[PDB]
Short mmCIF file of all heavy atoms in Angstrom, two decimals:
data_model
loop_
_atom_site.label_atom_id
_atom_site.label_comp_id
_atom_site.label_asym_id
_atom_site.label_seq_id
_atom_site.Cartn_x
_atom_site.Cartn_y
_atom_site.Cartn_z
N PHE K 132 88.54 154.82 63.79
CA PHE K 132 87.47 155.82 63.73
C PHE K 132 87.56 156.56 62.41
O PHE K 132 88.24 157.58 62.28
CB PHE K 132 87.57 156.80 64.90
CG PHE K 132 87.53 156.16 66.26
CD1 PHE K 132 88.68 155.68 66.85
CD2 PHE K 132 86.34 156.08 66.95
CE1 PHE K 132 88.64 155.11 68.11
CE2 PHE K 132 86.30 155.51 68.20
CZ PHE K 132 87.45 155.03 68.78
N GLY K 133 86.87 156.04 61.40
CA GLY K 133 86.82 156.70 60.11
C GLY K 133 85.44 157.20 59.76
O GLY K 133 84.75 157.77 60.61
N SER K 134 85.02 157.00 58.51
CA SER K 134 83.62 157.24 58.16
C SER K 134 82.71 156.28 58.90
O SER K 134 81.61 156.65 59.33
CB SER K 134 83.43 157.11 56.65
OG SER K 134 82.06 157.07 56.31
N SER K 135 83.15 155.04 59.06
CA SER K 135 82.51 154.06 59.92
C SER K 135 83.54 153.56 60.92
O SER K 135 84.70 153.34 60.56
CB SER K 135 81.94 152.89 59.12
OG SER K 135 81.25 153.35 57.97
N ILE K 136 83.11 153.38 62.17
CA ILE K 136 84.00 152.83 63.19
C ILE K 136 84.20 151.35 62.90
O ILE K 136 83.28 150.55 63.08
CB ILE K 136 83.44 153.05 64.60
CG1 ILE K 136 83.27 154.54 64.88
CG2 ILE K 136 84.35 152.41 65.63
CD1 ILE K 136 82.73 154.84 66.25
N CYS K 137 85.40 150.99 62.45
CA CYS K 137 85.71 149.61 62.11
C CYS K 137 86.50 148.96 63.24
O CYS K 137 87.59 149.43 63.58
CB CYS K 137 86.48 149.54 60.79
SG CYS K 137 85.56 150.12 59.35
N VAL K 138 85.95 147.89 63.81
CA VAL K 138 86.60 147.13 64.87
C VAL K 138 87.10 145.84 64.24
O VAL K 138 86.32 145.10 63.63
CB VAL K 138 85.63 146.85 66.03
CG1 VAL K 138 86.34 146.07 67.12
CG2 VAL K 138 85.06 148.14 66.57
N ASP K 139 88.39 145.56 64.42
CA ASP K 139 89.04 144.38 63.86
C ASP K 139 89.81 143.63 64.93
O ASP K 139 90.44 144.24 65.79
CB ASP K 139 90.02 144.79 62.77
CG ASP K 139 89.34 145.32 61.53
OD1 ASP K 139 88.13 145.08 61.37
OD2 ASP K 139 90.02 146.01 60.75
N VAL K 140 89.76 142.30 64.87
CA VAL K 140 90.46 141.45 65.82
C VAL K 140 91.44 140.57 65.06
O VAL K 140 91.10 140.02 64.00
CB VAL K 140 89.50 140.63 66.70
CG1 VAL K 140 88.64 141.55 67.52
CG2 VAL K 140 88.64 139.70 65.87
N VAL K 141 92.65 140.46 65.58
CA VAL K 141 93.72 139.68 64.96
C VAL K 141 94.16 138.63 65.95
O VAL K 141 94.45 138.94 67.11
CB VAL K 141 94.91 140.58 64.56
CG1 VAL K 141 96.06 139.74 64.01
CG2 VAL K 141 94.48 141.63 63.57
N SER K 142 94.25 137.38 65.48
CA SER K 142 94.63 136.26 66.33
C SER K 142 96.06 136.43 66.84
O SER K 142 96.82 137.29 66.39
CB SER K 142 94.51 134.95 65.56
OG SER K 142 93.25 134.85 64.92
N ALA K 143 96.42 135.58 67.80
CA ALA K 143 97.80 135.55 68.29
C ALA K 143 98.77 134.97 67.27
O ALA K 143 99.98 135.06 67.48
CB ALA K 143 97.87 134.76 69.59
N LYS K 144 98.27 134.37 66.19
CA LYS K 144 99.11 133.86 65.12
C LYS K 144 99.00 134.66 63.84
O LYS K 144 99.61 134.29 62.83
CB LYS K 144 98.77 132.39 64.83
CG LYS K 144 99.37 131.39 65.82
CD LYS K 144 98.53 131.27 67.08
CE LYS K 144 99.30 130.60 68.20
NZ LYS K 144 98.52 130.59 69.47
N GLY K 145 98.24 135.76 63.84
CA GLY K 145 98.12 136.61 62.67
C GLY K 145 96.92 136.35 61.78
O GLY K 145 96.91 136.85 60.65
N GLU K 146 95.93 135.59 62.23
CA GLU K 146 94.72 135.37 61.45
C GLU K 146 93.73 136.50 61.69
O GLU K 146 93.53 136.94 62.83
CB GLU K 146 94.08 134.03 61.81
CG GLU K 146 94.81 132.79 61.30
CD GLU K 146 96.05 132.44 62.10
OE1 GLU K 146 97.02 133.22 62.07
OE2 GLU K 146 96.05 131.38 62.76
N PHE K 147 93.10 136.96 60.61
CA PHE K 147 92.10 138.02 60.70
C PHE K 147 90.72 137.39 60.87
O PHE K 147 90.19 136.78 59.93
CB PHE K 147 92.14 138.92 59.46
CG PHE K 147 90.92 139.76 59.29
CD1 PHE K 147 90.62 140.77 60.20
CD2 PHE K 147 90.07 139.57 58.21
CE1 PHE K 147 89.49 141.55 60.04
CE2 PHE K 147 88.94 140.35 58.05
CZ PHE K 147 88.65 141.34 58.97
N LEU K 148 90.15 137.54 62.06
CA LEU K 148 88.87 136.91 62.36
C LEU K 148 87.71 137.74 61.83
O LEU K 148 86.84 137.23 61.12
CB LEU K 148 88.73 136.68 63.86
CG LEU K 148 89.87 135.91 64.53
CD1 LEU K 148 89.60 135.74 66.01
CD2 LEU K 148 90.08 134.57 63.85
N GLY K 149 87.67 139.01 62.18
CA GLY K 149 86.58 139.88 61.81
C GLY K 149 86.39 140.96 62.86
O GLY K 149 87.34 141.36 63.53
N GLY K 150 85.15 141.42 62.99
CA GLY K 150 84.85 142.46 63.95
C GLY K 150 83.49 143.08 63.76
O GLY K 150 82.48 142.38 63.69
N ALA K 151 83.45 144.41 63.68
CA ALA K 151 82.18 145.11 63.54
C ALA K 151 82.36 146.40 62.77
O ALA K 151 83.47 146.93 62.65
CB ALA K 151 81.56 145.40 64.91
N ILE K 152 81.25 146.90 62.23
CA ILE K 152 81.23 148.15 61.47
C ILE K 152 80.13 149.01 62.09
O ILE K 152 78.96 148.94 61.69
CB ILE K 152 80.98 147.93 59.97
CG1 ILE K 152 82.06 147.02 59.38
CG2 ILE K 152 80.96 149.25 59.23
CD1 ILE K 152 81.80 146.64 57.94
N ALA K 153 80.49 149.82 63.07
CA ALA K 153 79.56 150.75 63.67
C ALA K 153 79.51 152.04 62.85
O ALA K 153 80.43 152.33 62.09
CB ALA K 153 79.97 151.05 65.11
N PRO K 154 78.45 152.83 62.99
CA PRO K 154 78.43 154.14 62.33
C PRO K 154 79.49 155.07 62.90
O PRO K 154 79.86 154.98 64.08
CB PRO K 154 77.02 154.66 62.60
CG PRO K 154 76.23 153.47 62.99
CD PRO K 154 77.18 152.56 63.68
N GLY K 155 79.98 155.97 62.05
CA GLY K 155 80.98 156.92 62.49
C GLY K 155 80.40 157.99 63.40
O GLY K 155 79.21 158.29 63.38
N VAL K 156 81.27 158.57 64.23
CA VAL K 156 80.84 159.58 65.20
C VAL K 156 80.30 160.81 64.47
O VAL K 156 79.17 161.26 64.73
CB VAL K 156 82.00 159.95 66.13
CG1 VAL K 156 81.50 160.75 67.32
CG2 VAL K 156 82.73 158.70 66.59
N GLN K 157 81.07 161.34 63.53
CA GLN K 157 80.68 162.56 62.84
C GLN K 157 79.52 162.31 61.88
O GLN K 157 78.61 163.14 61.78
CB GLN K 157 81.87 163.16 62.10
CG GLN K 157 81.68 164.60 61.66
CD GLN K 157 81.53 165.54 62.84
OE1 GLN K 157 82.52 165.96 63.43
NE2 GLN K 157 80.29 165.89 63.17
N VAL K 158 79.55 161.19 61.17
CA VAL K 158 78.48 160.87 60.23
C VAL K 158 77.16 160.70 60.98
O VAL K 158 76.12 161.21 60.55
CB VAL K 158 78.83 159.61 59.42
CG1 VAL K 158 77.82 159.40 58.31
CG2 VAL K 158 80.24 159.73 58.86
N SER K 159 77.19 159.99 62.11
CA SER K 159 75.98 159.81 62.90
C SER K 159 75.47 161.13 63.47
O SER K 159 74.26 161.39 63.46
CB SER K 159 76.22 158.81 64.03
OG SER K 159 76.97 157.70 63.57
N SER K 160 76.38 161.96 64.00
CA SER K 160 75.93 163.23 64.56
C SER K 160 75.35 164.14 63.48
O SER K 160 74.33 164.80 63.71
CB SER K 160 77.09 163.92 65.28
OG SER K 160 76.62 164.77 66.31
N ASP K 161 75.96 164.15 62.30
CA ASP K 161 75.42 164.93 61.18
C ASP K 161 74.06 164.41 60.75
O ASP K 161 73.16 165.20 60.44
CB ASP K 161 76.40 164.91 60.01
CG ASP K 161 77.65 165.72 60.27
OD1 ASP K 161 77.67 166.46 61.28
OD2 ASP K 161 78.61 165.61 59.48
N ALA K 162 73.89 163.08 60.71
CA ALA K 162 72.60 162.52 60.33
C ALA K 162 71.52 162.87 61.34
O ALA K 162 70.39 163.21 60.97
CB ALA K 162 72.71 161.00 60.19
N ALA K 163 71.85 162.80 62.64
CA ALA K 163 70.90 163.20 63.67
C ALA K 163 70.53 164.67 63.53
O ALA K 163 69.36 165.03 63.68
CB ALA K 163 71.47 162.91 65.06
N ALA K 164 71.52 165.52 63.26
CA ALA K 164 71.25 166.94 63.08
C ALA K 164 70.35 167.19 61.87
O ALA K 164 69.44 168.02 61.92
CB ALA K 164 72.57 167.70 62.93
N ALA K 165 70.60 166.48 60.77
CA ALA K 165 69.85 166.73 59.54
C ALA K 165 68.42 166.22 59.63
O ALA K 165 67.48 166.91 59.22
CB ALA K 165 70.57 166.09 58.35
N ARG K 166 68.24 165.01 60.17
CA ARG K 166 66.91 164.39 60.16
C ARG K 166 65.94 165.12 61.08
O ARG K 166 64.74 165.19 60.79
CB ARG K 166 67.00 162.92 60.55
CG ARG K 166 66.22 162.00 59.64
CD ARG K 166 66.07 160.62 60.26
NE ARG K 166 65.51 159.65 59.33
CZ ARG K 166 64.21 159.39 59.22
NH1 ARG K 166 63.31 160.02 59.96
NH2 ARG K 166 63.81 158.47 58.35
N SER K 167 66.43 165.65 62.20
CA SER K 167 65.58 166.32 63.17
C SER K 167 65.54 167.82 62.89
O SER K 167 66.59 168.45 62.71
CB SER K 167 66.08 166.06 64.59
OG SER K 167 65.42 166.90 65.52
N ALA K 168 64.33 168.38 62.85
CA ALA K 168 64.18 169.82 62.68
C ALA K 168 64.74 170.58 63.88
O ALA K 168 65.43 171.59 63.72
CB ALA K 168 62.72 170.18 62.45
N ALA K 169 64.44 170.11 65.09
CA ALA K 169 64.90 170.80 66.29
C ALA K 169 66.40 170.65 66.51
O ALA K 169 67.00 171.49 67.19
CB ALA K 169 64.14 170.30 67.52
N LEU K 170 67.01 169.60 65.97
CA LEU K 170 68.44 169.39 66.12
C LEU K 170 69.20 170.10 65.01
O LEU K 170 68.82 170.03 63.83
CB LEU K 170 68.79 167.90 66.11
CG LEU K 170 68.30 167.06 67.29
CD1 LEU K 170 68.86 165.65 67.19
CD2 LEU K 170 68.67 167.69 68.62
#
């Protein structure tokens, strides 16, 4: 959980397969607050 939520998967032999890059919790909440006038 950083600036972006980075999900990583590692094989049972140590190979790095990949994962996902979701938006961060704080960055997303700040963006929602900024973009919306009521928020």
Side-chain angles (χ1 to χ4, degrees):
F132 302 86
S134 168
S135 315
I136 299 180
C137 296
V138 181
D139 290 343
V140 298
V141 176
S142 310
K144 281 82 196 175
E146 287 77 293
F147 163 66
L148 307 181
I152 302 174
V156 193
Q157 195 65 81
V158 189
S159 317
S160 207
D161 289 349
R166 227 194 189 268
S167 169
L170 293 186

